[PDB]
Amino acid sequence: DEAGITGTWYNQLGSTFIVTAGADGALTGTYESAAGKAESRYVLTGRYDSAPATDGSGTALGWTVAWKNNYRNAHSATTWSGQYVGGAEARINTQWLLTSGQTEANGWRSTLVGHDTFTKVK
Amino acid sequence: DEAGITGTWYNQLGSTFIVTAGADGALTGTYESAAGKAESRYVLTGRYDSAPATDGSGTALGWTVAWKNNYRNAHSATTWSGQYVGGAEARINTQWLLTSGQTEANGWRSTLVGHDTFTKVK
Amino acid sequence: DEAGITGTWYNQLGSTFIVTAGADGALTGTYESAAGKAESRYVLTGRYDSAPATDGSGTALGWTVAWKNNYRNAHSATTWSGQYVGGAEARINTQWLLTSGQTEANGWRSTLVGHDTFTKVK
Amino acid sequence: DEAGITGTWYNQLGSTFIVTAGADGALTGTYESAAGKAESRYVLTGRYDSAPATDGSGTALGWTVAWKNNYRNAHSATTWSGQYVGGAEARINTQWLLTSGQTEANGWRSTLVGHDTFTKVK
Lengths: 122, 122, 122, 122
Hints:
Four copies of one chain form a homotetramer.
Chain A: H1 2-5, E1 7-11, E2 16-21, E3 26-32, E4 42-48, E5 59-68, E6 73-85, E7 91-100, E8 111-119
PDB class: biotin-binding protein
Keywords: biotin-binding protein, beta barrel, metathesis, organometallic complex
Assembly: tetrameric
C-alpha cells in the first residue's frame, strides 16, 4: 500500500493532499486547504501501518499540518487520523482535530473536530 | 519554543514522548505507550507552529504514531492535536484520535477519541 | 424549525431517528440503529435551539440514546451533536460520541467518535 | 446507580450540573456553565444505562444542553458522552461536542470537542 497511498488526493472541500509513503511507514508531502485561514501549500508529515492485515481491512494512518508557511501563520495545527481503502474507488477516510493556540483559560475552546474523505478524483 | 518543546514528556497514563523540534516546524521522535497493544518505542513525526503569538497563547502542534515496530503491529495509528504551554509547569495539552484498520462496513467503529496531558515530570 | 425537525430521519447507515421537537426546545423520540449491538427502538431525548438566527445558519441541536431497551443492553450511550439545515434537501449534520461502560483503567478506550448525516429520504 | 447519579456535580471549569436519574434511564436537570456565552441555568436532558454490568465498569450516559434560556441565546448545543464511576471519589468522566449554528459552507468550523470531569465536591 505504499504504492496505493502515494500520490494526490482531494477532499469534499476541494483541498489537495500530495503525499509520498516511504517503505517503513513515513508519510511526507504538502497540503493545500480550500477552506479556512490558509494560502498556498503547507508541509505535512505523518505515519501509516506499512504492513496492514489482508482481510479487506483498511490501512491505518495519520498526518499533521501546522498552518504556517511563507504567506500565512494561522497559529494552529490539524491532525487527520484515518484509513486508506484501496481498489477502483480508493478512499482515505478521516477524522480530524484542529487545535488553535489559545490562553490556558480559553483551552476549552481550542479544538475543532470534523471529518474529511479523500479521493483520487475532483 | 523549539527549546521548550524539545525533550521528554510524560502523560497521565505513564506514556513517554521524546521529541526534537526543528527550527522550521518539524517534530521527530519516539513514543512509548504505557497502555494498549504497544511494546517498546514507536516512531513519531509531526509539526508545530514555529512562530506562536506572544499574548500568552500556547503553541499549536500535532504528531502521529503508527503502531508498528519490530515487536508489534497493532494495525492502527494515533494522532495527537494540541498545544504547548511553557513556564514552570510546562504542559502539552492534547486531544487524540486513534483509528484502527477496519472493513468499510465497520468504518463507524474505527476511531477512538480521548485526551492526554503531557508534563516534563513523572 | 419545530416543524422542520419533527418527523422521521435516516442516516447513511440505514438508521431511523423519529423525533418530535417541542416549542421550548425539547426533542423526544425513538432511534433504531442499522449498525452495532442494537435491536428494535431505543428512547432518545435531546434539545435544540428553538430560536435560530435567520442568516442561513443551521439550528444547533443534540440528543442522546442509551443502548438499553427490552431486547438488549449494550452498556453504552451515544450522543449526536449537530445542526438542522432546512429546505428542499433538508439535513441534520452530526458528529457523535459513543461511550461504553469500562473499568477506570480502560477509560482511554471507552469512547468512539464518528459522524452521521440525516436526510428525510431512504 | 439511579441513587449514585442523582444530585449536583461540578466540573474543572466550575460549571454545575444538577440532575435526576429516573428509574428507566432518564436524565433531567439543569446546567450552569462557568465558561463561554452562558448565563444562569439551562435545561438538560439525557439518558443513562439503568442496568450497568457489575464487573467494576462505569455506567454509560449522556446529555444535551441547548444554550438558550431567558437571558441568552448562544445558537449552539453541547452534548456530553461519558460514564459514571461510583465510590468514595465518584466521578462522571466525559467527552463533549459543542456545535454552533453555521452556514452550510462554514460547516467544517461548526463543532468544538473537549472533555470535562465531574465530581461531587468544589
